[PDB]
Amino acid sequence: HECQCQCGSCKNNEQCQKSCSCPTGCNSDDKCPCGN
């Protein structure tokens, strides 16, 4: 999905901007699954 994360790993990360698997509201790296 379109990426609307505010975590450090994803915010302005071009790799997952249009291919993000995170839960909505994924705002913390500690619980971020992106690219798992």
Which positions touch Cu ion (CB under 5 A)?
3, 5, 7, 9-10, 16, 20, 22, 26, 32, 34
2 labeled part of a ligand binding site: no
Distances (CA, A) of 24 to 3, 7, 32: 8, 11, 11
Tokens of 34: 């992106």
26 annotated binding-site participant? yes
For residue 10, report the phi and psi dihedrals to the nearest 5 degrees: -105, -25
CB of 34 to Cu ion, least distance (A): 3
Query: 16 a known binding residue?
Result: yes
